[PDB]
mmCIF file of C-alpha atoms in Angstrom:
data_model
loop_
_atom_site.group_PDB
_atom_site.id
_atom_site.type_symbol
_atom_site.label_atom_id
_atom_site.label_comp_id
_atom_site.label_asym_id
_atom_site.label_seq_id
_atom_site.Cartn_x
_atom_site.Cartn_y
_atom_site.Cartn_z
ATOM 1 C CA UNK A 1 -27.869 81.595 40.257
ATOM 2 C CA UNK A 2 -30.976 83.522 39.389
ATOM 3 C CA UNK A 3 -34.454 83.514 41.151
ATOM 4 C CA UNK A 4 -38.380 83.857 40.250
ATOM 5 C CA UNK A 5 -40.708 86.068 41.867
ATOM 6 C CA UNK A 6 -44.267 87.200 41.938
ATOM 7 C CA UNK A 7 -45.236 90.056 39.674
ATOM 8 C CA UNK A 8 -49.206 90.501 39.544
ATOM 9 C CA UNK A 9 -52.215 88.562 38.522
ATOM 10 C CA UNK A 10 -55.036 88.808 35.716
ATOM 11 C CA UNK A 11 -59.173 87.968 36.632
ATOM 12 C CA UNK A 12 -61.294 88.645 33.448
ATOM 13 C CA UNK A 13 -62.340 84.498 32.915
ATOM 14 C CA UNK A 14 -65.388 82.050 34.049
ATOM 15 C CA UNK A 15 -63.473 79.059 33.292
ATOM 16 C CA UNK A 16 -60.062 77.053 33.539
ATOM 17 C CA UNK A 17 -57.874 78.642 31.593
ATOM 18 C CA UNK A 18 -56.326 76.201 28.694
ATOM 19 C CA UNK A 19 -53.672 78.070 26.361
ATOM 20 C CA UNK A 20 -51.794 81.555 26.595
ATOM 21 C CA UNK A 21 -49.754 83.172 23.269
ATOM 22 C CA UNK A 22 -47.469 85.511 22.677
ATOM 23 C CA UNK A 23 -45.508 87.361 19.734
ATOM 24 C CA UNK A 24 -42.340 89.838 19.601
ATOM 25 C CA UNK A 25 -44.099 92.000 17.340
ATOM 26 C CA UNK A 26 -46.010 93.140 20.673
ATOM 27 C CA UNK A 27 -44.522 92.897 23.869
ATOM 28 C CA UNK A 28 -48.036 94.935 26.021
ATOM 29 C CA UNK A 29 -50.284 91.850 24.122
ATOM 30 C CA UNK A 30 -51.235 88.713 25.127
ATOM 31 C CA UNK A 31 -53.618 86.472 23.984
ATOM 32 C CA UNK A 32 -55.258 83.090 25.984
ATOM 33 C CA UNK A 33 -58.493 80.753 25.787
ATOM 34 C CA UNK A 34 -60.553 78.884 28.410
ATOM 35 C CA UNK A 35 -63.379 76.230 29.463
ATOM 36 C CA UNK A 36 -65.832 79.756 29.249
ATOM 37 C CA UNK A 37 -65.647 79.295 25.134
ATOM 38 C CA UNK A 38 -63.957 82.895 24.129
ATOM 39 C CA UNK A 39 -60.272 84.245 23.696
ATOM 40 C CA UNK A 40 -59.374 87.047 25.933
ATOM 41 C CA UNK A 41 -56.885 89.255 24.810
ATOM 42 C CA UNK A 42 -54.905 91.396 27.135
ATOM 43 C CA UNK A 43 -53.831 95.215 27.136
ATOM 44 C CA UNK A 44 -50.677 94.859 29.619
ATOM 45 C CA UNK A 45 -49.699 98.076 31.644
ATOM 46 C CA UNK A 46 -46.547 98.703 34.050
ATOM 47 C CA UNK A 47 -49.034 100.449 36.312
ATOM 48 C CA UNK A 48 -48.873 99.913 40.156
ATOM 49 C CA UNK A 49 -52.794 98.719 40.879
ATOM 50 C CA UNK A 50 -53.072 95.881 38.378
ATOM 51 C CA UNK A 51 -51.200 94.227 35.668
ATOM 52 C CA UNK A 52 -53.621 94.004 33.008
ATOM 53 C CA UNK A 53 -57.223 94.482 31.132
ATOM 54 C CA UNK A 54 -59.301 92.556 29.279
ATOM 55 C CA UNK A 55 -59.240 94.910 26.019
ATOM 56 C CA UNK A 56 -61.215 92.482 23.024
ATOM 57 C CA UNK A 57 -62.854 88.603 22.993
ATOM 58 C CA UNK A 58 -63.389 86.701 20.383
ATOM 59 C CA UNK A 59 -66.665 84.430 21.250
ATOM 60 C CA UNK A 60 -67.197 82.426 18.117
ATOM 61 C CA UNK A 61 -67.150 78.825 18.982
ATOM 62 C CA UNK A 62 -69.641 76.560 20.249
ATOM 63 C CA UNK A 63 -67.707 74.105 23.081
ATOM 64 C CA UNK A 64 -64.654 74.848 25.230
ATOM 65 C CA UNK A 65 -61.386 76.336 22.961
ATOM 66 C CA UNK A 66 -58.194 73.335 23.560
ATOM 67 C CA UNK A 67 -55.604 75.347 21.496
ATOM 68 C CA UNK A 68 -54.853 78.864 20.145
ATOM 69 C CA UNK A 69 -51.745 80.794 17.945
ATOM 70 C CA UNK A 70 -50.678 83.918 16.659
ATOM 71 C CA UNK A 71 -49.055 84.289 13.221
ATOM 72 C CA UNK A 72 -46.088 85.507 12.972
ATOM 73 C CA UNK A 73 -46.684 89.313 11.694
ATOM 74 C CA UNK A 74 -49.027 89.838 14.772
ATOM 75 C CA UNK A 75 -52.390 90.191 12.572
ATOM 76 C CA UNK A 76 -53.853 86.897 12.453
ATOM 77 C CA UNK A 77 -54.271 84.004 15.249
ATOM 78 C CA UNK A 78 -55.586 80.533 14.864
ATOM 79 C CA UNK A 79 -57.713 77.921 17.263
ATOM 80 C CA UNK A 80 -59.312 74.561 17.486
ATOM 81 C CA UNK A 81 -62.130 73.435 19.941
ATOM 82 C CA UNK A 82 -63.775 70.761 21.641
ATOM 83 C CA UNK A 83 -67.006 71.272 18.791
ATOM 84 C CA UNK A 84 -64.523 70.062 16.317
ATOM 85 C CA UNK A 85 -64.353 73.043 14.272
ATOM 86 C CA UNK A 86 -60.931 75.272 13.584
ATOM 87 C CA UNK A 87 -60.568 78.943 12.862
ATOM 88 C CA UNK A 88 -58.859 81.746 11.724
ATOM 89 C CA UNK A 89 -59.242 85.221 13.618
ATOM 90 C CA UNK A 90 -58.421 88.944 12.281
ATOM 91 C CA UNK A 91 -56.924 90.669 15.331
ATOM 92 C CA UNK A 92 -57.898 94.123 14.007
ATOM 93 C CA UNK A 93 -62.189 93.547 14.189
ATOM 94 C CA UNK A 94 -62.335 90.568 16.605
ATOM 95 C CA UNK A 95 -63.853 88.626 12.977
ATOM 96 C CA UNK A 96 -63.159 85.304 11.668
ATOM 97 C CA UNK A 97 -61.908 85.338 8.104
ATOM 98 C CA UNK A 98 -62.115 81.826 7.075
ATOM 99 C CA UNK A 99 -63.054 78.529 9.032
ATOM 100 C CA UNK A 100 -61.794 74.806 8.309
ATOM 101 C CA UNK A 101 -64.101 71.976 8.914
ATOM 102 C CA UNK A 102 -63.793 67.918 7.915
ATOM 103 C CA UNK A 103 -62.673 66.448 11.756
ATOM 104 C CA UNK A 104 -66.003 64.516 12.833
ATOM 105 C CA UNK A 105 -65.048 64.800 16.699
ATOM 106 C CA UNK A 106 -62.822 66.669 18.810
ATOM 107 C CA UNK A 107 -59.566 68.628 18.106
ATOM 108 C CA UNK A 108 -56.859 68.652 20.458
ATOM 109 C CA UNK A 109 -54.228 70.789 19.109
ATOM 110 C CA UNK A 110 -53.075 72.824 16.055
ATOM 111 C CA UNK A 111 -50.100 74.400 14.844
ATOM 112 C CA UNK A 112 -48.499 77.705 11.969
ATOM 113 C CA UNK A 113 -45.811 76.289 9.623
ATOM 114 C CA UNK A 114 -42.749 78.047 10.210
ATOM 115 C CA UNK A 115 -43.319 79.882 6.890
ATOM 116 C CA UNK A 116 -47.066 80.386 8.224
ATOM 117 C CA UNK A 117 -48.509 78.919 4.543
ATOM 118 C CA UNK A 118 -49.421 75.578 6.288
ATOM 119 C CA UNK A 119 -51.449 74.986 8.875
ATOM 120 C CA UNK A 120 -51.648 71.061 10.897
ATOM 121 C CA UNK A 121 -53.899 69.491 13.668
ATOM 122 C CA UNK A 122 -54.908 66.472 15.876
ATOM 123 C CA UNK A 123 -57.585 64.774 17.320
ATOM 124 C CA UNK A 124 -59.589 62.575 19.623
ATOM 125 C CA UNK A 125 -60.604 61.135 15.767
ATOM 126 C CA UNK A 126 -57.138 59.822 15.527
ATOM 127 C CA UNK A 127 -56.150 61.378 12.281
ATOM 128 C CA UNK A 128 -53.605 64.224 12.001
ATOM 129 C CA UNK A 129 -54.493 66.248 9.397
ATOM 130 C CA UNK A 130 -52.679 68.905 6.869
ATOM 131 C CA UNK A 131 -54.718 72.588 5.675
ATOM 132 C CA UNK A 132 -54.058 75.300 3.000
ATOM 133 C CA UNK A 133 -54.884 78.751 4.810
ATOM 134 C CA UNK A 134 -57.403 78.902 2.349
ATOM 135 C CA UNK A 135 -59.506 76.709 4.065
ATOM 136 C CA UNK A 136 -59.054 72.966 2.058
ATOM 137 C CA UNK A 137 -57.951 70.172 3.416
ATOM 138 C CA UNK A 138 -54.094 68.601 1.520
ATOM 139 C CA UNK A 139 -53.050 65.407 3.457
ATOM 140 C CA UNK A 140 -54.517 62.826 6.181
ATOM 141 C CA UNK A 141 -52.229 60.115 7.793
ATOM 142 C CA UNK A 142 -55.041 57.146 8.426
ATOM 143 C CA UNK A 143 -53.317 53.723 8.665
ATOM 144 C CA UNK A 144 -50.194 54.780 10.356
ATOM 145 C CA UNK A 145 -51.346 57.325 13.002
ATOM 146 C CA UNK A 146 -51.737 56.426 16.528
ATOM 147 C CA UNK A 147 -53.744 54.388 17.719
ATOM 148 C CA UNK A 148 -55.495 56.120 20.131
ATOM 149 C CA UNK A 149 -56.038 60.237 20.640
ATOM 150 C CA UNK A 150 -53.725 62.304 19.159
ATOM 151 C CA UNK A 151 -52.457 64.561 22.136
ATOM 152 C CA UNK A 152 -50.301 67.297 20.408
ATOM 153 C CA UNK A 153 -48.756 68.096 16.896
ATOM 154 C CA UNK A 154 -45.695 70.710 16.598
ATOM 155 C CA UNK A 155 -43.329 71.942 14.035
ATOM 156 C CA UNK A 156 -39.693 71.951 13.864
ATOM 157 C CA UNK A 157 -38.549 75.960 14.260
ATOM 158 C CA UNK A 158 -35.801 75.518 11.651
ATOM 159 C CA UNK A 159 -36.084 75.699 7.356
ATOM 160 C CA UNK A 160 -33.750 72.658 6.709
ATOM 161 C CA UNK A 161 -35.738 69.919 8.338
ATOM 162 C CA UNK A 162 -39.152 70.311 7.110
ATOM 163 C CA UNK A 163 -40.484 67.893 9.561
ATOM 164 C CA UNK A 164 -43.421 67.309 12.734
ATOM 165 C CA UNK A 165 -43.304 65.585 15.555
ATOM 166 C CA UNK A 166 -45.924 64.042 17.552
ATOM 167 C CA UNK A 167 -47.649 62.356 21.090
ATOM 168 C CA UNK A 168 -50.624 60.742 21.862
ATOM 169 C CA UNK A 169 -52.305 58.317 24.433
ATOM 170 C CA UNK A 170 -51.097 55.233 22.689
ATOM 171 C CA UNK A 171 -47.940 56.122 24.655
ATOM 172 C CA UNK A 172 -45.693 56.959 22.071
ATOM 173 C CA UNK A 173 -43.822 59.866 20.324
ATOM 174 C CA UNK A 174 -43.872 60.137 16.710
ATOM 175 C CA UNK A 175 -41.943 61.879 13.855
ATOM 176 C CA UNK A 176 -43.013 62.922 10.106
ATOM 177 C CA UNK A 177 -42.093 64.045 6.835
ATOM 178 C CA UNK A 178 -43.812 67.015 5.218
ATOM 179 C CA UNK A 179 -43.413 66.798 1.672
ATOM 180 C CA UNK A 180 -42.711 63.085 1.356
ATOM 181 C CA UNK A 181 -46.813 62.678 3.919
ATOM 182 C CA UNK A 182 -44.996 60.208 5.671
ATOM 183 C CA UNK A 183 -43.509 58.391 9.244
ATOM 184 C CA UNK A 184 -40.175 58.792 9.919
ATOM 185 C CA UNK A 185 -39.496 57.204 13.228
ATOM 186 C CA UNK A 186 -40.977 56.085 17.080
ATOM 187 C CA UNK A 187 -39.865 56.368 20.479
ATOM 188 C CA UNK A 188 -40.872 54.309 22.816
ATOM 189 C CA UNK A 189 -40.280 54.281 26.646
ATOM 190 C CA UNK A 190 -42.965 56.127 28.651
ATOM 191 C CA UNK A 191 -45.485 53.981 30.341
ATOM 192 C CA UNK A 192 -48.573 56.430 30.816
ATOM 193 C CA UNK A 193 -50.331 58.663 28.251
ATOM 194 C CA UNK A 194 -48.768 61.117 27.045
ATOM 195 C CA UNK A 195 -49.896 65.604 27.620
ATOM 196 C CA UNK A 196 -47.485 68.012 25.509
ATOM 197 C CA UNK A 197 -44.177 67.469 23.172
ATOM 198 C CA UNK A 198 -41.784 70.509 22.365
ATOM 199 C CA UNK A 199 -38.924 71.431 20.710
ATOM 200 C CA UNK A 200 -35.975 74.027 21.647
ATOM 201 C CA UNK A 201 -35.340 76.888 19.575
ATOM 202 C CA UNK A 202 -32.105 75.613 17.863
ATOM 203 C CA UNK A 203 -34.509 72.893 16.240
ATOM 204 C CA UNK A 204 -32.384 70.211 17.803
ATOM 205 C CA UNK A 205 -34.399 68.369 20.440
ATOM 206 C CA UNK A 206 -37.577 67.370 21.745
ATOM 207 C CA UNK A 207 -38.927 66.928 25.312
ATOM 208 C CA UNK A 208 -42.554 65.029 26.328
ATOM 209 C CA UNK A 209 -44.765 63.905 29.277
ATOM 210 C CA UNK A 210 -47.256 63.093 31.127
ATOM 211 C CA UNK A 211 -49.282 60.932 34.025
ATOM 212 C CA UNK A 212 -45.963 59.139 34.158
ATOM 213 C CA UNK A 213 -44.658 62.102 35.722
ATOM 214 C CA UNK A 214 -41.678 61.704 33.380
ATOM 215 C CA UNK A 215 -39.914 64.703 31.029
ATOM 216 C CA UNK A 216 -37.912 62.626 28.856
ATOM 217 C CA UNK A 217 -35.449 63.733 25.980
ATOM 218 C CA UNK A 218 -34.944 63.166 21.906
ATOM 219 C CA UNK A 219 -33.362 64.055 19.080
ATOM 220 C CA UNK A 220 -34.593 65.295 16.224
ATOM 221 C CA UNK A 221 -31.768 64.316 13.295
ATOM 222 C CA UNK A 222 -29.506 62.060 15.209
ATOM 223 C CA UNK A 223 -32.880 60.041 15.545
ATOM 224 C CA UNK A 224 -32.119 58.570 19.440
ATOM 225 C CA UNK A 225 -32.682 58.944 23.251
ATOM 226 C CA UNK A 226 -30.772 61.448 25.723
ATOM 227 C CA UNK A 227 -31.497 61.571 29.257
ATOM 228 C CA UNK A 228 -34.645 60.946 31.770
ATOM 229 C CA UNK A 229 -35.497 63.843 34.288
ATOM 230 C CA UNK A 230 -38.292 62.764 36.841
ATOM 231 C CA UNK A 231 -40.465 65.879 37.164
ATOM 232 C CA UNK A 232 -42.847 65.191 40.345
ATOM 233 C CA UNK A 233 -46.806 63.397 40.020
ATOM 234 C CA UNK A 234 -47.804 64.484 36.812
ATOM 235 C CA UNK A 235 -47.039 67.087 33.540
ATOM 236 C CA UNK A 236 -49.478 69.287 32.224
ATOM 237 C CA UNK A 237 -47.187 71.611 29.922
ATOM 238 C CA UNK A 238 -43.531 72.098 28.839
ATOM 239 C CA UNK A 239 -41.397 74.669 27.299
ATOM 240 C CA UNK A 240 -37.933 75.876 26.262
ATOM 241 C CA UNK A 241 -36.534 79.459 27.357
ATOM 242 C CA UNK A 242 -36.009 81.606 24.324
ATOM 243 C CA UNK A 243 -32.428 82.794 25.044
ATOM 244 C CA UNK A 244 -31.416 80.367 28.015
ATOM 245 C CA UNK A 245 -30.436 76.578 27.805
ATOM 246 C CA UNK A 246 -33.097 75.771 30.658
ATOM 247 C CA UNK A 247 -36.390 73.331 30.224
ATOM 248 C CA UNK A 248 -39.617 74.335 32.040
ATOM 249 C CA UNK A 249 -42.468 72.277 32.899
ATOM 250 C CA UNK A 250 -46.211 72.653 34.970
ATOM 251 C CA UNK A 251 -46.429 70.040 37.288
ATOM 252 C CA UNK A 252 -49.873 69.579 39.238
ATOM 253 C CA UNK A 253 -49.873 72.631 41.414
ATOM 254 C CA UNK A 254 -46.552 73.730 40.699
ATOM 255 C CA UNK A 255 -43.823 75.054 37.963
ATOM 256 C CA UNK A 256 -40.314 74.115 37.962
ATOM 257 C CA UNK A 257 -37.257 74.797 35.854
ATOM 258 C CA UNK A 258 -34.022 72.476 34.749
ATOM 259 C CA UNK A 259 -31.017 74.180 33.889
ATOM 260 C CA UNK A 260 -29.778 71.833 31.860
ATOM 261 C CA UNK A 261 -26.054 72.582 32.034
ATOM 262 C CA UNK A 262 -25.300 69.885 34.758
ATOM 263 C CA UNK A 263 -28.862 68.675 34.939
ATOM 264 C CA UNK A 264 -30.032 70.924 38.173
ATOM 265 C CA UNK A 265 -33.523 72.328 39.295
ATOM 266 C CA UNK A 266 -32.987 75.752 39.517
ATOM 267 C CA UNK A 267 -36.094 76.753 41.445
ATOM 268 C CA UNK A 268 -39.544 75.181 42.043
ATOM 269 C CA UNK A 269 -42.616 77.736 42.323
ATOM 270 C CA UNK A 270 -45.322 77.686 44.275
ATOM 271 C CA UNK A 271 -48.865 79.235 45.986
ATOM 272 C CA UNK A 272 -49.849 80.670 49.144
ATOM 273 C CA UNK A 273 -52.178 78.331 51.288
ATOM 274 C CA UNK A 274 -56.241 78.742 51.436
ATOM 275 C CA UNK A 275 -57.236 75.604 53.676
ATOM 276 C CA UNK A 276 -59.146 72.976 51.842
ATOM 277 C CA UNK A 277 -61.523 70.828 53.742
ATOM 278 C CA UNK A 278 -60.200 68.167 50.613
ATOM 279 C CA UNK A 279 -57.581 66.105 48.678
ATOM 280 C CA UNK A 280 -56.010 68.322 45.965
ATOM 281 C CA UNK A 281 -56.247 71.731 48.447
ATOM 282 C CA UNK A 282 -53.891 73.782 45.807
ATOM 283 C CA UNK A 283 -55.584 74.781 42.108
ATOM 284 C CA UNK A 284 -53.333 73.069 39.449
ATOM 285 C CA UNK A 285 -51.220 74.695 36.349
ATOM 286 C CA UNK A 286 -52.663 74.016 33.121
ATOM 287 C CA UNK A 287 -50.467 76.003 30.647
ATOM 288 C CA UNK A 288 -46.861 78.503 30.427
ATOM 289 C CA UNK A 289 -45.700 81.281 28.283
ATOM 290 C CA UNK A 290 -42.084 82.685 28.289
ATOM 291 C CA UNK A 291 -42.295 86.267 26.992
ATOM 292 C CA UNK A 292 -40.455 87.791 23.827
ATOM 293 C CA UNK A 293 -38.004 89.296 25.996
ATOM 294 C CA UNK A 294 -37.471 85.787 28.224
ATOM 295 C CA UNK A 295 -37.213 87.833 31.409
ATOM 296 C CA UNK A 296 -41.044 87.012 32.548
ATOM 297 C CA UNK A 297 -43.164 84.139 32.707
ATOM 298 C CA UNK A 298 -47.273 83.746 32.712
ATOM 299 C CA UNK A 299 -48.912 80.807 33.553
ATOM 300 C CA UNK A 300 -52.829 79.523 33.654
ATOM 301 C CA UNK A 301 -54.415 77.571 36.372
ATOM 302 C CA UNK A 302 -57.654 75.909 37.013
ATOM 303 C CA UNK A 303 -58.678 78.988 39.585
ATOM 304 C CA UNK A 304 -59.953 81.453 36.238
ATOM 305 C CA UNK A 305 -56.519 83.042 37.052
ATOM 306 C CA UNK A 306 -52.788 83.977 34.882
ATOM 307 C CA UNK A 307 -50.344 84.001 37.355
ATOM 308 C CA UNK A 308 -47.113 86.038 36.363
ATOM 309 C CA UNK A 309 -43.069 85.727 37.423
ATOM 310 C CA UNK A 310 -40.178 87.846 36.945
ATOM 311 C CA UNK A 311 -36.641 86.676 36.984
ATOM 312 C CA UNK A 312 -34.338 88.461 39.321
ATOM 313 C CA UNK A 313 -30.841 88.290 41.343
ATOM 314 C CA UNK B 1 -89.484 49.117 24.532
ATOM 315 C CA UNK B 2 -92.862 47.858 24.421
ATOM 316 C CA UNK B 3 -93.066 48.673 21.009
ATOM 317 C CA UNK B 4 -90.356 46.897 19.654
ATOM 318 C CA UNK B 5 -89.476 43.737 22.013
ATOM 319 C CA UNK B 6 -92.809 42.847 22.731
ATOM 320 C CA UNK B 7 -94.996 40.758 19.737
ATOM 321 C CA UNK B 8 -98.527 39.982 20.856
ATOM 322 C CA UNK B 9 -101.716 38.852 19.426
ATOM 323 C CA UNK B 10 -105.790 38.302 19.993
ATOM 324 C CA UNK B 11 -108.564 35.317 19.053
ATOM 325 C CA UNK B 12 -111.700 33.818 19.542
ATOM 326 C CA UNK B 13 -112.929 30.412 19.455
ATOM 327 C CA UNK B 14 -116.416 28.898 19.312
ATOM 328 C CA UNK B 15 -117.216 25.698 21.461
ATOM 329 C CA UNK B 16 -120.779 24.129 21.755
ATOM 330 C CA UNK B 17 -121.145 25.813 25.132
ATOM 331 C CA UNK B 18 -119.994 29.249 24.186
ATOM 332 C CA UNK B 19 -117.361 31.590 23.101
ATOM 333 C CA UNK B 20 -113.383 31.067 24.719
ATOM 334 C CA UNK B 21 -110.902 33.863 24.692
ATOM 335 C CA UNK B 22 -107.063 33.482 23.523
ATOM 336 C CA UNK B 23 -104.290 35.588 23.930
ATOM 337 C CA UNK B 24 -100.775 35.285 23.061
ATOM 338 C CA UNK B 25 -97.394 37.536 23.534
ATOM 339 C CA UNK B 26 -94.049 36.547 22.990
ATOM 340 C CA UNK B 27 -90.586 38.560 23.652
ATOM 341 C CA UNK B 28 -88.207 39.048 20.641
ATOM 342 C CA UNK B 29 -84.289 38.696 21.511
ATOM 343 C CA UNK B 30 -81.799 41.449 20.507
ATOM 344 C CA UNK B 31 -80.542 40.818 16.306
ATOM 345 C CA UNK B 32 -77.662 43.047 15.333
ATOM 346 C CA UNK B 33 -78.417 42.321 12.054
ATOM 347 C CA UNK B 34 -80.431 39.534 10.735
ATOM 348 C CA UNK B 35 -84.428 40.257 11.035
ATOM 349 C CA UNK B 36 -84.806 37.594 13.704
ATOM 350 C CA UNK B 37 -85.794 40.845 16.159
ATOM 351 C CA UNK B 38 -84.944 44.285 16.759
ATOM 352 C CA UNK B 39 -81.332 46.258 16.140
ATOM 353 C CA UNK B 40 -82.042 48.672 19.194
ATOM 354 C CA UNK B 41 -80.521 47.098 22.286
ATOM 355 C CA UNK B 42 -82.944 47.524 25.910
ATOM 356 C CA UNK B 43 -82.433 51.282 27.400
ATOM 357 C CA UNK B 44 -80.999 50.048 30.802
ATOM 358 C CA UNK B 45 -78.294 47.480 29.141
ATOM 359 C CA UNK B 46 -74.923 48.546 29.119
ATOM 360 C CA UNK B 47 -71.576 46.791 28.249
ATOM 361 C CA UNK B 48 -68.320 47.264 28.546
ATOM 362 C CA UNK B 49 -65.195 46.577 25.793
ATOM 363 C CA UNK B 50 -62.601 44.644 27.430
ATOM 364 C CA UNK B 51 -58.719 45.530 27.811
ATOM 365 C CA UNK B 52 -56.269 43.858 26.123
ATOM 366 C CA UNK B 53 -52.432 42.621 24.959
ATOM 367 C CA UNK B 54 -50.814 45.752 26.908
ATOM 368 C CA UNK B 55 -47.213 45.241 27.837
ATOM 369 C CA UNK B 56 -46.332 46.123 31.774
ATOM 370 C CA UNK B 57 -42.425 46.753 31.588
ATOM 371 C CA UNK B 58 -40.836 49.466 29.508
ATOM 372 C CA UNK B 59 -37.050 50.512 28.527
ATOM 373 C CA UNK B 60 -36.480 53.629 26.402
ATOM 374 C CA UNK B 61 -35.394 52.677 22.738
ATOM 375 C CA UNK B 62 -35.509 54.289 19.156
ATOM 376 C CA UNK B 63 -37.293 52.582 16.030
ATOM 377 C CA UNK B 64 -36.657 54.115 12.400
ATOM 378 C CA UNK B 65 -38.450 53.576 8.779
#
């Protein structure tokens, strides 16, 4: 079966890095945010000496940057941060053409509509919230949201479901109607709080976790539970491959991939030692990116560092 | 805090033998609400909420609206 390896590394940060993005609309361009407050993004180059350079950053917002995304035309991305404040960024200038403000804490995570005309975000306010891309705020969910931070907020990939699904530290995963403003259904079964939810590319599943150490999966329309994979101490991040029917998740110091045809780890990944007079000796994986093409994977750690695999035979 | 727990107050008093001296300062307890005393709580006081109702087992299961 096929193997990872080491590709190269990237080194233009001051802080743990949080979020990394991508597009097919330009495979030498990535784009990632930090604890330092500013987006990097990156020219990438097949050149021997190093993988990449720091070519723009955007330095616009006032605390640490939790979230960022890229539209799908390649022009536009958006972000939230820890000052509570979300915004819109022209790719072409490095400018911000239009900023969204009416959280009165803390934002978490935010996400595109599929269509990219709708843009959604939560909180350590406990409200998701709904935004025209004009800058005014549509919806808020009040009563029925969790009842404690709201972790992460996604969209389903597909047109026929208009729906979002949901986690927070309240332990449980939630599901929503778009046009109707409304809860559709729980799951309930993890025991810690919960990191990350995602969804495969098909639109047909979900996957979640956290301190639990737990990736468990869902359904989106047959509205019930699948299997229970136990991923390690704790998970940080997960994702779907683009083009392969394999889960991947960061797990403390590590990354590690399910192929889940028969339920198997495929490989686990791993860093070379620097002795630690300490508990926690390795630097831990914070965030993942498949690329466009699915063949190579970046990930950000708590060391200022992206860290980047190939697949190979 | 001084300024705000503390209510004090000054007098004199003539005897047959002379002037006596009174003083008098009394400390206000923490009001919420209510004008009794203050709303602001002493710098070096702090309390913690207290946990409750959580359930310790857990079985994976589906709930729909």
């Amino acid at each position: 079966t096929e193997q990872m390896t080491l590709r190269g590394t990237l080194k233009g940060h001051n802080g743990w890095v949080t979020q990394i993005a991508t597009t097919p609309q330009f495979p030498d361009m990535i784009l990632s945010a930090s604890r330092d407050k500013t987006i990097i993004m990156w020219k990438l180059t097949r050149d021997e000496t190093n993988y990449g350079i720091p070519q723009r950053a955007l330095r616009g917002h006032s605390h640490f940057v939790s979230d960022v995304v890229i539209s799908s035309d390649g022009q536009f991305a958006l972000s939230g941060s820890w000052d509570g404040t979300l915004r819109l960024w022209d790719l072409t200038t490095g400018t911000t053409t239009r900023r969204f403000v009416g959280h009165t804490k803390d934002v978490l995570s935010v996400a595109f509509s599929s269509d990219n005309r709708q843009i959604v975000s939560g909180s350590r306010d406990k409200t998701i919230k709904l935004w025209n891309t004009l800058g005014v705020c549509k919806y808020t969910v009040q009563d029925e949201s969790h009842s404690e931070w709201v972790s992460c907020v996604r969209f389903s990939p597909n047109s026929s479901n208009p729906i979002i699904v949901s986690c927070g530290w309240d332990k449980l995963v939630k599901v929503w109607n778009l046009a109707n403003c409304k809860l559709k259904t729980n799951h309930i079964g993890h025991t810690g709080y919960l990191n990350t939810v995602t969804v495969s590319p098909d639109g047909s599943l979900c996957a979640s976790g956290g301190k639990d150490g737990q990736a468990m999966l869902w359904d989106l329309n047959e509205g019930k539970h699948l299997y229970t994979l136990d991923g390690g101490d704790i998970i940080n991040a997960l994702c779907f491959s683009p083009n392969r029917y394999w889960l991947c998740a960061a797990t403390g110091p590590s990354i590690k991939i399910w192929d889940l045809e028969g339920k198997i780890i495929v490989d686990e990944l791993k860093q070379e030692v620097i002795s630690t007079s300490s508990k926690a000796e390795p630097p831990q994986c914070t965030s993942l990116a498949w690329s466009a093409d699915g063949q190579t994977l970046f990930a950000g750690y708590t060391d200022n560092l992206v860290r980047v695999w190939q697949v190979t035979i | 805090p001084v300024n705000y727990y503390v209510d004090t107050a000054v007098r004199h008093v003539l005897l047959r033998q002379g002037v006596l001296g009174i003083k008098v300062k009394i400390m206000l307890p923490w009001d919420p609400s209510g004008k009794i005393g203050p709303k602001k709580p002493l710098p070096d006081h702090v309390s913690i909420v207290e946990p409750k109702d959580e359930i310790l087992p857990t079985t994976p299961i589906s709930e729909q609206k």
